Amino acid sequence: KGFGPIFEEQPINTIYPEESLEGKVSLNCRARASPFPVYKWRMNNGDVDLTNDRYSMVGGNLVINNPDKQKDAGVYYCLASNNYGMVRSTEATLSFGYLDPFPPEERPEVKVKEGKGMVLLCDPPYHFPDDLSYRWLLNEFPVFITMDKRRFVSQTNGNLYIANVESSDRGNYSCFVSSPSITKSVFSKFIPLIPIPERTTKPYPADIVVQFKDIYTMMGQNVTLECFALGNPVPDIRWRKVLEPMPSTAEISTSGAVLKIFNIQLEDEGLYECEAENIRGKDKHQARIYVQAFPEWVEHINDTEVDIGSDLYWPCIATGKPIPTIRWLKNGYSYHKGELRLYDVTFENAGMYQCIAENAYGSIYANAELKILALAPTFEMNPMKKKILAAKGGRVVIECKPKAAPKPKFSWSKGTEWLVNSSRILIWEDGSLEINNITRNDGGIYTCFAENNRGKANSTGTLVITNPTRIILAPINADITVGENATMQCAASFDPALDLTFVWSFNGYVIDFNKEITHIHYQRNFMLDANGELLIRNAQLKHAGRYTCTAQTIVDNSSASADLVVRG
Amino acid sequence: KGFGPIFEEQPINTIYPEESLEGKVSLNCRARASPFPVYKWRMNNGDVDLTNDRYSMVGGNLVINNPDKQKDAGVYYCLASNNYGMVRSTEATLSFGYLDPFPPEERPEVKVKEGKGMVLLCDPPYHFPDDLSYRWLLNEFPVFITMDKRRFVSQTNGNLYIANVESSDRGNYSCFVSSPSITKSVFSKFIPLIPIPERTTKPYPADIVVQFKDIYTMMGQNVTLECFALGNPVPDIRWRKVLEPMPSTAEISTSGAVLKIFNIQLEDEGLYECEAENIRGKDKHQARIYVQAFPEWVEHINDTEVDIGSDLYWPCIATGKPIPTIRWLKNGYSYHKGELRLYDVTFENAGMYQCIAENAYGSIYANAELKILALAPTFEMNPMKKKILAAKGGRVVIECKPKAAPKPKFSWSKGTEWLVNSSRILIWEDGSLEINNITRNDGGIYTCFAENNRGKANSTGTLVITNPTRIILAPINADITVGENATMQCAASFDPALDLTFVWSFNGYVIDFNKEITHIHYQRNFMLDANGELLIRNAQLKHAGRYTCTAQTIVDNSSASADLVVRG
Ligand SMILES: *[C@@H]1O[C@H](CO)[C@@H](O[C@@H]2O[C@H](CO)[C@@H](O[C@@H]3O[C@H](CO[C@H]4O[C@H](CO)[C@@H](O)[C@H](O)[C@@H]4O)[C@@H](O)[C@H](O[C@H]4O[C@H](CO)[C@@H](O)[C@H](O)[C@@H]4O)[C@@H]3O)[C@H](O)[C@H]2NC(C)=O)[C@H](O)[C@H]1NC(C)=O
Ligand SMILES: *[C@@H]1O[C@H](CO)[C@@H](O[C@@H]2O[C@H](CO)[C@@H](O[C@@H]3O[C@H](CO[C@H]4O[C@H](CO)[C@@H](O)[C@H](O)[C@@H]4O)[C@@H](O)[C@H](O[C@H]4O[C@H](CO)[C@@H](O)[C@H](O)[C@@H]4O)[C@@H]3O)[C@H](O)[C@H]2NC(C)=O)[C@H](O)[C@H]1NC(C)=O
Ligand SMILES: *[C@@H]1O[C@H](CO)[C@@H](O[C@@H]2O[C@H](CO)[C@@H](O[C@@H]3O[C@H](CO)[C@@H](O)[C@H](O[C@H]4O[C@H](CO)[C@@H](O)[C@H](O)[C@@H]4O)[C@@H]3O)[C@H](O)[C@H]2NC(C)=O)[C@H](O)[C@H]1NC(C)=O
Ligand SMILES: *[C@@H]1O[C@H](CO)[C@@H](O[C@@H]2O[C@H](CO)[C@@H](O[C@@H]3O[C@H](CO)[C@@H](O)[C@H](O[C@H]4O[C@H](CO)[C@@H](O)[C@H](O)[C@@H]4O)[C@@H]3O)[C@H](O)[C@H]2NC(C)=O)[C@H](O)[C@H]1NC(C)=O
Ligand SMILES: *[C@@H]1O[C@H](CO)[C@@H](O[C@@H]2O[C@H](CO)[C@@H](O)[C@H](O)[C@H]2NC(C)=O)[C@H](O)[C@H]1NC(C)=O
Ligand SMILES: *[C@@H]1O[C@H](CO)[C@@H](O[C@@H]2O[C@H](CO)[C@@H](O)[C@H](O)[C@H]2NC(C)=O)[C@H](O)[C@H]1NC(C)=O
Ligand SMILES: *[C@@H]1O[C@H](CO)[C@@H](O[C@@H]2O[C@H](CO)[C@@H](O)[C@H](O)[C@H]2NC(C)=O)[C@H](O)[C@H]1NC(C)=O
Ligand SMILES: *[C@@H]1O[C@H](CO)[C@@H](O)[C@H](O)[C@H]1NC(C)=O
Ligand SMILES: *[C@@H]1O[C@H](CO)[C@@H](O)[C@H](O)[C@H]1NC(C)=O
Ligand SMILES: *[C@@H]1O[C@H](CO)[C@@H](O)[C@H](O)[C@H]1NC(C)=O
Ligand SMILES: *[C@@H]1O[C@H](CO)[C@@H](O)[C@H](O)[C@H]1NC(C)=O
Ligand SMILES: *[C@@H]1O[C@H](CO)[C@@H](O)[C@H](O)[C@H]1NC(C)=O
């Protein structure tokens, strides 16, 4: 009677700000067990030395003081152990956020002809996390650039694209890069932009300068595609899917340069086309969108308890767009490559088992405990039935299923005589006893013996035999016209000790007699101790058919059928 | 805009205690209507005078002062009238509870031989409500007789039956009758009972003296059956069904002399047998239990509004164990004999209609209002579609459904020319227009005119015709082995204004492309403006079959199929 280690908290991927006020980085790991568990940690698939005046432990959590990329960056995972086995936590990656300021060198001036679009390169500084948000400031820091059809800011390159340049756009433009992971924002030095005036602005055809390449995205994620063009007449951008309908969860946005898809499905895979139009010309661009899916469990493993010597199959099934591979760990070490199947299970197999399902994109863990039971045969839970009722000429099966672990051997003895396999007497291996073509000499006391490696068990039962239930008078077929009265006769013989009932069925279907419609034309008039007749009034065409009377008792049932024809 | 009278509160059967403290009896009747209703009352199928001083009116409720059996007891019902018709309330019976005290005459003494059962007659006084409860007192009023297997108290006759008489039974016995309806209790004069002692008492066989006759009871009601026998050895009573199982909601009780059935079903109909046993002999008694069911609505009528000249069918359906008869009243007077059906409805038919469903046991009312509408044809709610899309050689139907009462006449005009019934052009009577084998000359502006007895209406619409979508290159049948790559080709021609899609189906079922299983072997590949091919990888036996490519657009769809054979 114990409790294996179960993971409550597992470490997650973490990024530590380089300039954080706190000098400590903590990874969380916590587990439950009946004997208090022991926690261990591993770094880059290698053991981590304890003490050293750097690492510290806080109830299973690993704390590092003044971490340096040259020392701590990498993969950590946690191990929870006890007297019943070990369990491994999900691998967690620890990295450090990096973001330097822009170079303080002055930016050169840029002159642009009015009516000609231009591109401004942000050239962001060095950074470790690539989840950067880009904006642009005008003249002063508090000022920001509004998103229009002429002005576009790429979220990948970080550049600023102006389709049409006018005198109103003149001024100093600076880039602004923010990282939310490290919460650090920096702006570049301002670039003066001067538009040379023109009296006869020249039109330019639409040219797509911001394109979106082939993108692999996961199911359920939010995906954004960018497409932008330049030209003297403000170009219009339209999105469409190739010979297919656009996904329902699609937002073109007001600007028309960004396409957002929420909770992408497997159907959305294919080509997407962005078309830019103006008065002078037009352009088209096609891109590939591939859809993938993280591994998701179908039948995850649960704490299981099995008997000794019994073959065991654990169903571990996961589904993903790329067929995921299945792995099996035992106490934190590789054990199986998929479809774990055990034979002649013993105490050695018991422990903690972990099924991993991993594709090329993600991996999911499932933890469980396998316990082994060793028990002597006992009939306390499912004892033998005191009285069993049987009839002559009918096969009878007596169940003797005890609670035993190693699947013990079964024997049957008729009180003072031992039974063996015979023609009409059969002992199948599940423990029950079969008797065919029964006679009154068969009734008596039967004892079921179960012999096991650990102990033996004996159970007693009594079987009594009664006369079979048969039908003396069967119903006679009849033919009548519409609107006449019909009578169906049924009389049965049974054992007085047993209770007999009569059930009428029409064309293979039992009549319920609980609906008002059936009572109109059908009535049951059971009389005497064995007479069970049926009356039909105001017969109709649909009433004609097969009527079967069944005498039913607790041991067997006997049926006799007849036909009723209705003419007009 | 009017509103007919609708009943909120209806009078119920009432019993008034003869010696009540309050001297007024009130019957409640309430209805709502847009013109405030007028209330009338009827007594014993006859009008009741409003000015009698005894009677008074309180907001539609009828109050009676100092009611007397000879004058006021009987059947009352309420009538709610207005400018739109009359409605009748459910008939309510008003009766007066009656219970006089016992006669003060002394009761003679009764001597009984020990070992012989006896019967004590209550002789209850006159009473109007028959829901009497019987008990018995010994010597003093607070003392009561407990019900045992020897002592039984009938709830119908009210007598006390003693199966075995002993010396302890001597004493004075008085009957006690209570009525819950009037909450009145009275006890009779005491009867002295003296048992003559006997030595070596001889046993007597069991004789059933309390029997239960054939009983008709309604579905869902509570049924009680009484059976009791007498004899020197205290007899045991058992209840059973002849050739069927006893109802689940059956309680035999501790005494064994009363059988209780709760929420009786239609199945409980049949014979019930009571068996009394002792040492000397036994006895059996059979009785018939018949089950009935009150009328219950299936599709009761509701306030309905219909147009003029339209045939009307009123569905009024009720179900009961005895087939209920259906009657139709109009404004409180007989109108129809069942299944009311009206043709060429006019203003005269509008009013208040009452469907009654009554069997031999109960009756159910259903009140409703039938309104008739006369309206000029209008296209405000369902105007003509501004733009209609069609294809060459394809049949097209243009819907012109106005809101008009007498089903007006319809005409169609191509702007300046009137259309008539033709070979390819047919104008059916519902108002829509059908065109077959359409050509480019057919496209244009069509006007639907609706001429009615009351006014006319004109609606305008524009129908544009486009080229049909067909398949230039059809898929080619292919035969391959398992594990091979197959390509199915499909190319279509369509009108550039319309948007075209491609749908692939396998063996008459469209492929969803939303399940991970389909993506394993199927890859849909679309290119250009008309190329839509499909790729099958790692073919299996189950993949072989019929593949159909369907080019689908807003106007029509064109399909082409092919076959794929798999070997190996
Ligand atoms: C034939 O006999 C049966 C059985 O006696 C009657 O049916 C019972 O009627 C009583 C009331 O007359 C019901 O009791 C009520 O139960 C309500 C809750 O119903 C649920 O819970 C009960 C008990 O577990 C279930 O049986 C039932 O199916 C439901 O699941 C309570 O809310 C009621 O309380 C209110 O009314 C009582 C009335 O005395 C007040 O005292 C309370 O203060 C409160 O206002 C009430 O207790 C009972 O549930 C019904 N069924 C059964 C099986 O007992 C038939 O009415 C009766 N028919 C005829 C024609 O005689
Ligand atoms: C221009 O051309 C159009 C198209 O042919 C005509 O529209 C037809 O109008 C006639 C009436 O003049 C319609 O005939 C009637 O149709 C009724 C509805 O039929 C449907 O429902 C029945 C129900 O059983 C179906 O069996 C049937 O297949 C339909 O689905 C019928 O109920 C009518 O039956 C009888 O009614 C009277 C009653 O006395 C008899 O006198 C009749 O002779 C008839 O036996 C009747 O058949 C016809 O249905 C309309 N066409 C279509 C396609 O529905 C226009 O009338 C014609 N002229 C003008 C000016 O528009
Ligand atoms: C956008 O970038 C442009 C870059 O060209 C920038 O233009 C410069 O602005 C400064 C600030 O106004 C200018 O410097 C001034 O020039 C005027 C005209 O010559 C002088 O009168 C000013 O003198 C005052 O300030 C001096 C500061 O030392 C004092 O010493 C003096 O006593 C006066 O108080 C001042 O020198 C500069 O000429 C322009 N142009 C260039 C090429 O630098 C612009 O300001 C930026 N911001 C915008 C446009 O919002
Ligand atoms: C007395 O008679 C009974 C009644 O037959 C007998 O019980 C039988 O035992 C045999 C031996 O195991 C059972 O046969 C097996 O049953 C299991 C469960 O269904 C099957 O999985 C087995 O299939 C394998 O074995 C076959 C060869 O037996 C192979 O050909 C097959 O390809 C499989 O590899 C096998 O069929 C049999 O089912 C029972 N009978 C039952 C359950 O009704 C008993 O052994 C006899 N002797 C005694 C009691 O001393
Ligand atoms: C993708 O965006 C949707 C936006 O709806 C996210 O769904 C939730 O939307 C509600 C809107 O009120 C937000 O309050 C929630 O915070 C959103 N998230 C969740 C988990 O509920 C969705 O989560 C986004 N998915 C990703 C992967 O970013
Ligand atoms: C078929 O039997 C039924 C049931 O008896 C007959 O219906 C009624 O039966 C009662 C029996 O007491 C008679 O009093 C009625 O006169 C019978 N008729 C009706 C209409 O209720 C039924 O009549 C019998 N069949 C025929 C063809 O008469
Ligand atoms: C059928 O075509 C598919 C698609 O071209 C082939 O898939 C290849 O799969 C392997 C393993 O994932 C990739 O490395 C290859 O790149 C895929 N092919 C191409 C062209 O990229 C598949 O092998 C083909 N099978 C047969 C029997 O021809
Ligand atoms: C394990 O328990 C979960 C609890 O919801 C259940 O969904 C799952 O089916 C169980 N495992 C198996 C193999 O049934
Ligand atoms: C059956 O087992 C019980 C133990 O529970 C034992 O007392 C009894 O003697 C056994 N019967 C035999 C061996 O016949
Ligand atoms: C019954 O009444 C009689 C008549 O007065 C009396 O003699 C006798 O004692 C009474 N019995 C009991 C038990 O009080
Ligand atoms: C009639 O109205 C009642 C409610 O008043 C509703 O329960 C019933 O379903 C309605 N039946 C029809 C046919 O509209
Ligand atoms: C349609 O009817 C309206 C009034 O009902 C009228 O003003 C209009 O001129 C009519 N149009 C045609 C085309 O008859």
Numbering used by the authors:
A (entry chain B), B (entry chain A): 37 to 604
Lines from the paper:
The Ig5–Ig6 combination orients away but nearly in plane with the Ig1–Ig4 horseshoe in a curved architecture giving the molecule a sickle-like shape, with Ig1–Ig4 forming the “handle” and Ig5–Ig6 the curved “blade”. Contactin 1 Ig1–Ig4 horseshoe segment resembles previously reported contactin 1, 2, 4 and 5 segments. Contactin 1 forms a larger-order zipper in the crystal that is also formed in solution and the neurofascin 155 binding site is exposed in this oligomer. The zipper arrangement emerges from four interfaces, denoted α to δ, that capture four separate dimeric arrangements of constituting chains. The dimer burying most surface area buries 2980 Å2 and does so using twice the interface α where Ig3–Ig4 on one molecule contact Ig6 of the other molecule. The second dimeric arrangement involves interface β burying 1190 Å2 through Ig3–Ig3 interactions between chain A and a symmetry related chain B. In interface γ, Ig3 of chain A contacts Ig5–Ig6 of a symmetry related equivalent molecule, whereas interface δ forms by Ig6–Ig6 interactions between chain B and a symmetry related chain A. Addition of a contactin 1 molecule to a dimer formed through interface α to form a trimer, contributes two additional interaction interfaces, e.g., β and γ. In particular the glycans on Asn258 of Ig3 and Asn521 of Ig6 are located close to intermolecular interaction sites and may influence interactions depending on their composition. Contactin 1 may however form cis interactions, and the zipper is compatible with cis-interactions as the c-termini, that connect to the cell surface, are all on the same side. While contactin 1 and neurofascin 155 interact in a mode similar as to neurofascin30 and contactin 222 homodimerization, in the structure we report contactin 1 does not form homodimers via the Ig1–Ig2 interface.
